[PDB]
Amino acid sequence: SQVSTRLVRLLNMVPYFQANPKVTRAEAAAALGVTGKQLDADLDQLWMCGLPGYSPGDLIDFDFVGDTIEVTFSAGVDHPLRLTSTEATGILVALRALVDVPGMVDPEAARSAIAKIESAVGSQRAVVEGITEDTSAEPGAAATVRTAVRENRALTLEYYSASRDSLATRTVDPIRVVLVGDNSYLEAWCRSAEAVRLFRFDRIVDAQLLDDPAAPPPPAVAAGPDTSLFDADPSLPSATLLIGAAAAWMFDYYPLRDITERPDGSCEATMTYASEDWMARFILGFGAEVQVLAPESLATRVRQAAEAALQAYARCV
Amino acid sequence: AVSKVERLMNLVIALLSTRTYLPAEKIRTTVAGYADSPSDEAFSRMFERDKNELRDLGIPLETGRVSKWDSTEGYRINRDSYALPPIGLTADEAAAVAVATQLWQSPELVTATQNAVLKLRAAGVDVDADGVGVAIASTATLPGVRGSEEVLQSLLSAIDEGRAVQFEHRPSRSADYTTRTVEPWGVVTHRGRWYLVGHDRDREDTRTFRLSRISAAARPIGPAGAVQKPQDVNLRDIVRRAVAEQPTGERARIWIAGGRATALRRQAVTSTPRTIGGRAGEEITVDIGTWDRLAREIASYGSDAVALEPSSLRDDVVERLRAHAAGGER
């Protein structure tokens, strides 16, 4: 319960103070994630408890120098408590989950951390394991992105826009790196369009470092971590489409809305599209599995595109 | 008047600082907090409850005999087993841990990760998250991490306890739920997707289940220690095999107009320029893999991509395009 965690924290406080000789109040509060009054009460409670006998030279006593904390007699408390199975398993799971995400953490650091934690806790091959012992799938652009984020230097990115299906070379300045679903996006301010955009790592062919350490406007204007300006907007058009039973692939990787069930397969769903061409390609991909319902203009455009493709195939050989 | 936390701290300090086993009566007499019990039975009950709590907190108590000339049982705490070995952490590892400590959202996992990070920091290293300046945006829309959070916790607990699991799994939304009882072996992640590896007790085969499909009812059953997975089995290799079976299918020649189909351009194996029907582009010889996926990719681009060989794929694309061009009646 709460008492158990409090006891663990109060027992592990002593080695933390022994490691850092003159840690202040604010640093300790930030490290242990507790309020000032709670920290003071815990420290005072730890002050009056120690080795049996309860002589003033037999219990743990501190040495308050102004607003600094130092240990003069630990009474045998020299090392922190071990790691239970649950917490170590959770840490290992998180570390092995973040090693495959591109750009959020250096894979070498993650592997070194995994090795050190396994050696410290004595874990074996009966724990969670990744797929790639050595990825080598990093093109080096992710490392350049991380370096630019750390050093606040201008970057040149060649991004593949799937909605317009093109390659655009832009000069952008990073702001922060965020994780959305299973696709981490680098957030950057672009002066070509002068806007905050989220670029996906797998869509970046290569990155170029440049010697233009210019502070982006958003830090001087507004630096909201989210900035979901068009992640979900009502202005985004939505097409109403009928989906067959066999075509269940799109039911998982895309945000279908207003799902209506029908044994006859006459009830449909609605999904938003950024561009008309993207939705047309998405519809044409599934073939007869997906039938167009609304809008009528989109259906006419899809029919015209299909007729043009049929004519092109007839002409070609 | 001694608080519970103070009593437990005194007890653990007294046990740690003694090199000889301590019987119950000595603990009652010496350690503070055990001198206010109105009766011996009440003291015994309180001491047993405290020892159960301390053992539950992971502290490795050892029970033995005081000496070869005495028989009363005594208690001790090993100083070697209680102390984790020292570890040296660089800046990169500290940054990695600081980034990874901000992923979970379940209160139990959050508490466990916080306690682990506190112990790691108290070990001597300095883990700081503000230096990197990387945050997490999505916390309630993830289908792998956030969506598969409670199920993963239940699976991890069952694996730790060495017990089989019974749950409800469906291959797809169209299909129906099926009750599956399997003995788990571990959890393996691939492309940021979890995949539970186990042996089914209803089909007797090694199966990998995507945690997104499974609902939250991951009920643990079976006695503890009844699960003995083979050590020579490599879970990651099985996961890799299950991810993809068809290596390359065949080699297909597809014509694509220049300047477009960049996603298909990246997938090109060999290319050769050619102009057909007044439109220039490149004919590429590529792999097949999943036939339906390649057919969808070809049909998406329409006139931009023209299939040449094999003829079966061209016929399939033509049939799908004619079905689309029928007007939606069928």
Residue numbers in the entry:
A (entry chain Y): 2 to 318
B (entry chain X): 2 to 331
Tell me, in the authors' exact words, what the paper reports.
The DNA damage response in mycobacteria is controlled by the heterodimeric transcription factor PafBC, a member of the WYL domain–containing protein family. PafB and PafC each feature an N-terminal HTH domain, followed by the WYL domain and a WYL C-terminal extension (WCX) domain involved in heterodimer formation. Here, we demonstrate that the binding of single-stranded DNA (ssDNA) to the WYL domains of PafBC activates the transcription factor.
In our structure, the WYL domains are positioned diametrically, forming the broadest part of the heterodimer. They connect to the C-terminal WCX domains via flexible linkers providing additional flexibility to the WCX domains. The ferredoxin-like fold of the two WCX domains from MsmPafBC reported here, as well as their interaction with each other, is structurally similar (root mean square deviation = 2.04 Å) to the WCX domains of AauPafBC solved by x-ray crystallography. In our RNAP-bound structure of PafBC, the previously proposed ligand-binding grooves of the WYL domains are oriented toward the WCX domains. In the surface representation of the refined PafBC model, a distinct tunnel is visible between the WYL and WCX domains, extending across the entire heterodimer. The Fo-Fc difference density map revealed extra density within this tunnel, linking the WYL domains of PafB and PafC. The arginine residues (PafB: R211/R214 and PafC: R201/R204), which are essential for ssDNA binding to PafBC, are oriented toward this additional density, substantiating its identity as the ssDNA ligand. These observations demonstrate that our structure captured PafBC in an active state, complexed with ssDNA. Although the overall fold of PafB and PafC is similar, the distance between the WYL and WCX domains in PafB is considerably larger than the corresponding distance in PafC. Although the lower resolution of the ssDNA density precludes structural modeling, we show that, instead of two ssDNA molecules binding to the two PafBC WYL domains, a single ssDNA molecule extends across the heterodimer and contacts both WYL domains simultaneously.
